[PDB]
Amino acid sequence: RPMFAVAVNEFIRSAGQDSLCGVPDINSSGDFMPLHIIVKEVPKVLPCCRRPKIKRTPYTLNDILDEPCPNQLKSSDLVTFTEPLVSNVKASSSIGLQILKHFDSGAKGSKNFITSASLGTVVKAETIDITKVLAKVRTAKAKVENDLVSRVMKTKRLCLGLVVETACVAAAGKLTEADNWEISGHTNANIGEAVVTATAELDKNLSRKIEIPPGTALAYSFMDLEILEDRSLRVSSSAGAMFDSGKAES
Amino acid sequence: RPMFAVAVNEFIRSAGQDSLCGVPDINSSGDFMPLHIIVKEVPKVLPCCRRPKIKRTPYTLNDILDEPCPNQLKSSDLVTFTEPLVSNVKASSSIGLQILKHFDSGAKGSKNFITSASLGTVVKAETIDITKVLAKVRTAKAKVENDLVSRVMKTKRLCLGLVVETACVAAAGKLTEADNWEISGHTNANIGEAVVTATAELDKNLSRKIEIPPGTALAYSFMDLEILEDRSLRVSSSAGAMFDSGKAES
Amino acid sequence: RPMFAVAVNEFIRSAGQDSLCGVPDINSSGDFMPLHIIVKEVPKVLPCCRRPKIKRTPYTLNDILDEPCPNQLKSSDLVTFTEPLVSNVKASSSIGLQILKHFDSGAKGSKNFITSASLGTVVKAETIDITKVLAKVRTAKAKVENDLVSRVMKTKRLCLGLVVETACVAAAGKLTEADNWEISGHTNANIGEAVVTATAELDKNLSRKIEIPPGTALAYSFMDLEILEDRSLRVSSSAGAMFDSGKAES
Amino acid sequence: RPMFAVAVNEFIRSAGQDSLCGVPDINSSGDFMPLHIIVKEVPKVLPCCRRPKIKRTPYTLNDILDEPCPNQLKSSDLVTFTEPLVSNVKASSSIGLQILKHFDSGAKGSKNFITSASLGTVVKAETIDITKVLAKVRTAKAKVENDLVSRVMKTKRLCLGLVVETACVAAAGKLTEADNWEISGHTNANIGEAVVTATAELDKNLSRKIEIPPGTALAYSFMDLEILEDRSLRVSSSAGAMFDSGKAES
Amino acid sequence: RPMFAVAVNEFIRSAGQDSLCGVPDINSSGDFMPLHIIVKEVPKVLPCCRRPKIKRTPYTLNDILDEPCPNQLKSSDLVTFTEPLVSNVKASSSIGLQILKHFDSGAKGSKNFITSASLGTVVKAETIDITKVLAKVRTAKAKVENDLVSRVMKTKRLCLGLVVETACVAAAGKLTEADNWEISGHTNANIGEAVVTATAELDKNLSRKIEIPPGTALAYSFMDLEILEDRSLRVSSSAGAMFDSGKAES
């Protein structure tokens, strides 16, 4: 592949290659704004070799917590792509096989792929003060009525994560892709009593152009949490990171 | 007046003539953003005939309260002045007095006053959800350490008010004023043994042009509060208004 | 006035002269959307001769009620002003007084006033089903915590009203006003030993042009309510009207 | 006025002068569709000389009745105004009064009023079968929970009416009005020691143009009802009319 | 008025001056189709000098009767207006009064009235066989549930009538009216110490053009009925007429 995923990967590579998680799709981009709860699932096969699985939830911190916390936000510029990211790929190949005067095959193929992404300006949105939010979380108990919290508490693989910063496009972003590929093949099987001559030509052309609106989220970072025996919540730091990017322990 | 005060009065008359309080000055405009505490003082002479006195304080709701409340905000367009407000005043007068052939005075005056105000677009900023803030306030106690709360509790004239909505200019606003006035007087006192001939001319020209930056507050509305015997706070409604504009009871 | 008030009066006269209440100001226009609680105060002097006083409150039906009710809305076209409402007033007068050869005064005045209002298309927004809302209200109790309800219950003048329909501009509305007036006066007092000749000329020019954004409310209608001894709420109909326009009983 | 009222009166005079009730305003036009409950109030002063008062209610027959009734409708053409109704009024007068050589007054006035109404095609909408609706009403009991029914039952002046047919514009209707009037007066009071010369000129110009959308109701007819001791409902006919136009008994 | 009433009177005079009743209005024209029940009320003051009052009802013969009757209809041409009925009236008058050299009044008036009615072709619709309908009516009992029948039975003034033939326009009918009238008056009252000169001119112009659709009823004839002690119905003939035109007995 999707153009949105390709553009997200390009952005995350160019800026914030570490401590940043890509957004799965445009539809679910809006669920990864700051102060949102997400669920993390361990690979269960190769935890140190495979990145975990991130699931969005329709909850905020104030909803998940019995005691509310301040939720004011602020935004500031992060990076600016002055010119569109342009990519061109052009391949062409030909194969010719001959077996005596009995077999003669000639194949050829070509492909032309063009991509352009214009992200404009990308800003970052985050809580005005994170220390106060963390303090209130640590001193606040989760909602007893909520079922998700209980599920995560009883299960061992599931973990909770609070999103703390999000990268969003300030203006409309344009994504354009063009594809043109062609195959031409020919086969000649000559035998003493049989002659076969086959030929096949085809070519496909595609073009997709979309425009994401302002405010679409691109990437995010989150901090882990831990449910106590009671509804109380605590913050957890793997080697003091306090910033999880959904990376394998390794 | 001051050009800022004149423009504030013009804006408040054109839009929101009721339930809106003008901003005293540009410097103190920034202290009347939403979720700010202000102090109201009764006239003490003609409370029903004179509007009360409003004093700004360097406190927010979360600071004044022991228990924090959600503080997220949102803004939306309110009004748009497509063309500048232009005002012209032009006065000219002349006086001539004669007493026989003994007194002869001739005076004249003129004045030209021009004003132009370009406010562009005005937006309104307010809490995303006011019901939650009100509930938390009612269930939350004020800061025991704070001295202002204790002062207001012990005094009877002082009242507390929480600012809930503010009108701010989206872009830079331009205020221009030009003044040109002139006085010319002449006096002739003729007496049998004395002749006095006096003349005086003067003229003053002034021009002031300023530009307020984006985000400057113009007007606000607030809701009253009441300190219980304890640090607890309650909301008070005069005839169920719940929106005080600093108006006399009448 | 105010241009907004003049335009609201013009609209309410042209369409919906009955069962419709004007909006006090642009700032408070947004508080009169459907399913909003308002407070009505009786004149207390001439209740049958004076229209009551309407106060806005920051509450919705679901907030004021312990038991929530459906709140979905729908909108449909109401009226369309194809061309701007244009008004012109032009007055000019002159006065001349003479008393023998001792007094001679000549005064003159002129005024030119132009108004233009372009409201575009006006739509009406209202609950999809009002019968369900009414049933749930009648079977639902108010919020015990809420102070406004208790105030209205204990007081006899105050009444509660639920807003059920609102008229809003679909697109931006333009209001333009121009004023030009002039006064020229002259006085001549001739006496045997005194001659006084005074003259005064002045003229004022004003122009105000504003643009209200789409969605601004213009007028509304509401239904009365009654607090039982308990938190229960009931609907009240004066002669079966069930649609109060803030009119005197007469 | 109002242009809508004038157009409604013109339509009701041209077609259906009997057994038809005008619509009070555009806003409340939508509440007089077929199968709607309305309340009728007697004059209480001169019942046989004054037409009663009609109040709209937010209820349908199925809502007001415990047992539902069929509610399907059908529409058919009623009348077609091929050309706009055009009206012109032009008045001009002058007065001259003279008393010897001591008083001399000259006044003059003029007025030009133009109206144009284009209603296009008017259709009539009514229940497909009214006999079935009447039978079910007679055999069905009203809603015990409903308060309006109880109010009408206990009161003697109030009566219930079911709307059975409505006239609505098929397409958009255009209403245009232009007014231009002028007054010019002059007064001359000549006395032996006093001369007064006053003059006053003014002129007002107005123009209002609106367009009602398709489906707007213009007029309606209704049938009376009667609440039994129980919730049962019955139909009532004054001299067997069964079609009430809100007319005095006379 | 009304043009429809004028056209109905013109048609009924030109054709079927006897045994035909005009239709009150376009809206109620559709209720006078064949096999419809109507109510007749006696004058109660001068029954032999005043024509009775006819009231429409929303009932058919099969609905009013417990036992159904055949109801098939048929239509055939009645009359054809090849050219529009055109009427012109033009009046003009002037009055001049003089009393010595003290009073002088001159008044004048004019009026021009034009009418055009194009009814096209008029057809007549009636039951295919009336003898069978009459026989079944005589042998059939009315609906006990129906209230109208009981009312007419208990009252002595009310009578029932079954409509048996109706005149309807085959195609669209066009009605046009133009009015132009003018008044000009002048008054001069000359007295030894007073002179009064008044003048007043006015003129009104109106034009109304409508088009009734095909199928609109114009006139009808009906036969009287009589409720027995039981629900049984009988036919009644005043001097064997069996065709009542709503005429006084005389």
Interface test with E, best of D8, D20, D98 (most E CBs within 10 A): D98
For residue B147, give the 3-state DSSP assignment. Answer: helix
Dist CA C96 CA C110 (whole Å): 15
Dist CA C36 CA C63 (whole Å): 10
Dist CA C59 CA C46 (whole Å): 29
Phi and psi at B93, nearest 5°, equal -145, 155
> In terms of Cα–Cα distance, which of D66, D245, B94, B62 is closest to A135?
B62
For residue B176, give the 3-state DSSP assignment. Answer: strand
Nearest chain E residue to D89 by CA distance is E204
Contact: C15, D4; criterion CB under 8 Å:
yes
Smallest Cβ distance to C197: which of B19, B90, B96? B96
Contacts D151 to C, Cβ<8 Å:
237, 240
Touch C-D: 3+ C-beta pairs under 8 A: yes
Nearest chain C residue to D148 by CA distance is C240
What's the gap in Å between the CA of E176 and the closest CA on chain D? 10
Contact: D92, E202; criterion CB under 8 Å:
yes
Touch B-C: 3+ C-beta pairs under 8 A: yes
Nearest chain D residue to E55 by CA distance is D241
Dist CA C161 CA C64 (whole Å): 12
Residue spans of beta strands (DSSP E) within D11-120 = 21-22, 36-41, 53-60, 73-80, 85-99, 103-118
Contact: D239, E39; criterion CB under 8 Å:
yes
Phi and psi at D174, nearest 5°, equal -115, 130
Whether D167 and D122 have beta carbons less than 8 Å apart is answered as yes
Dist CA C231 CA E206 (whole Å): 61
Dist CA E230 CA E142 (whole Å): 9
Structure-determination approach? cryo-EM
What are the Cα distances from residue A164, in Å, to A134, A138, A146? 11, 16, 22
Q: Which two tokens stand for residue A66?
A: 């019995």
Contact: C239, D39; criterion CB under 8 Å:
yes
Between chain D and chain E, the number of residue pairs with CB atoms below 8 A apart is 142
Which position has the token pair 């207001």? B152
Contact: B96, C198; criterion CB under 8 Å:
yes
Chain B residues with CB under 8 Å of a chain A CB are 62, 68-73, 132, 136
Nearest chain B residue to C148 by CA distance is B240
Whether E194 and E161 have beta carbons less than 8 Å apart is answered as no
Phi and psi at B40, nearest 5°, equal -115, 130
Chain A residues with CB under 8 Å of a chain B CB are 62, 68-73, 132, 136
Dist CA D85 CA D12 (whole Å): 13
- Which stretch of DSSP H or E encloses residue D149? helix D147-154
Torsion of CA D232, D233, D234, D237, to 10 degrees: 160
Q: Which two tokens stand for residue C178?
A: 């121009």
> In terms of Cα–Cα distance, which of E243, E118, E204, E120 is closest to E170?
E120
> In terms of Cα–Cα distance, which of E62, E51, E201, E34 is closest to E128?
E34
Contact: A69, B73; criterion CB under 8 Å:
no
Dist CA B221 CA B165 (whole Å): 6
Q: Which two tokens stand for residue B46?
A: 């003609």
For residue B174, give the 3-state DSSP assignment. Answer: strand
> In terms of Cα–Cα distance, which of E31, E45, E19, E40 is closest to E226?
E40
Dist CA B31 CA B53 (whole Å): 16
Phi and psi at B51, nearest 5°, equal -75, 145
Dist CA D106 CA D134 (whole Å): 68
Which residue pairs, CB below 8 angstroms and at least 24 apart, start in E185-192? Answer: E185/E105, E185/E106, E185/E107, E185/E108, E186/E105, E186/E106, E186/E107, E187/E104, E187/E105, E188/E103, E188/E104, E188/E105, E189/E102, E189/E103, E190/E101, E190/E102, E190/E103, E190/E104, E191/E102
For residue D185, give the 3-state DSSP assignment. Answer: strand
What's the gap in Å between the CA of B238 and the closest CA on chain A? 29
Whether E133 and E124 have beta carbons less than 8 Å apart is answered as no
Smallest Cβ distance to C212: which of B79, B89, B243? B79
Interface test with C, best of B123, B130, B242, B247 (most C CBs within 10 A): B242
Contact: A68, B73; criterion CB under 8 Å:
no
Contacts D232 to E, Cβ<8 Å:
none
Torsion of CA C146, C151, C154, C155, to 10 degrees: -150
What are the Cα distances from residue D215, in Å, to D26, D172, D173? 11, 8, 10
Which position has the token pair 């909301």? B235
Q: What residues form DSSP beta bridges with D90?
A: D112, E203
Interface test with D, best of C6, C11, C97, C137 (most D CBs within 10 A): C97
Q: Cβ neighbours of residue A4 under 8 Å, at least 6 residues apart?
A: A23, A25, A26, A175, A210, A212
Contact: C240, D151; criterion CB under 8 Å:
yes
Contact: B240, C172; criterion CB under 8 Å:
no
Whether A201 and A183 have beta carbons less than 8 Å apart is answered as yes
Whether A223 and A19 have beta carbons less than 8 Å apart is answered as no
Phi and psi at C243, nearest 5°, equal -150, 100
What's the gap in Å between the CA of E129 and the closest CA on chain D? 25
Contact: D196, C19; criterion CB under 8 Å:
no
Which position has the token pair 């679409």? A216
Whether A218 and A29 have beta carbons less than 8 Å apart is answered as yes
Nearest chain E residue to D139 by CA distance is E145
Q: Which two tokens stand for residue B60?
A: 């927010």
User: What single DSSP character describes residue B143?
Assistant: P
Contacts A129 to B, Cβ<8 Å:
none
Which position has the token pair 């990519």? A87
- Which stretch of DSSP H or E encloses residue C53? strand C53-60
Dist CA A129 CA A125 (whole Å): 12
Phi and psi at E210, nearest 5°, equal -130, 165
Contacts C37 to B, Cβ<8 Å:
none
Residue B50 one-letter amino acid: R
Whether B187 and B122 have beta carbons less than 8 Å apart is answered as no
Smallest Cβ distance to B79: which of C26, C28, C195? C26
Interface test with E, best of D13, D14, D123 (most E CBs within 10 A): D14
Task: Tell me how far the alpha carbon of residue A173 is from its chain's centroid.
Answer: 16
Q: Which two tokens stand for residue C110?
A: 């002129």
Phi and psi at B30, nearest 5°, equal -75, -10
Q: What residues form DSSP beta bridges with D168?
A: D123, D217
Expressed in angstroms, the distance from the first to the final Cα of chain A is 27
Which residue pairs, CB below 8 angstroms and at least 24 apart, start in B40-44? Answer: B40/B158, B40/B159, B40/B160, B40/B161, B40/B224, B40/B244, B40/B246, B41/B157, B41/B158, B41/B159, B42/B157, B42/B159, B43/B248, B44/B157
Q: What residues form DSSP beta bridges with A189?
A: A103, A196
Q: Cβ neighbours of residue E3 under 8 Å, at least 6 residues apart?
A: D14, E115, E117, E175, E177, E208, E210
Dist CA D83 CA D121 (whole Å): 11
For C18-30, the three-class secondary structure string (H helix, E strand, C coil) is CCCEECCCHHHHC
Contacts B18 to C, Cβ<8 Å:
24-25, 27-28
Smallest Cβ distance to B82: which of C39, C205, C209? C209
Task: Tell me how far the alpha carbon of residue D194 is from its chain's centroid.
Answer: 56
| Cα Rg of chain E, angstroms | 26
What's the gap in Å between the CA of C194 and the closest CA on chain B? 5
Whether C14 and D3 have beta carbons less than 8 Å apart is answered as yes
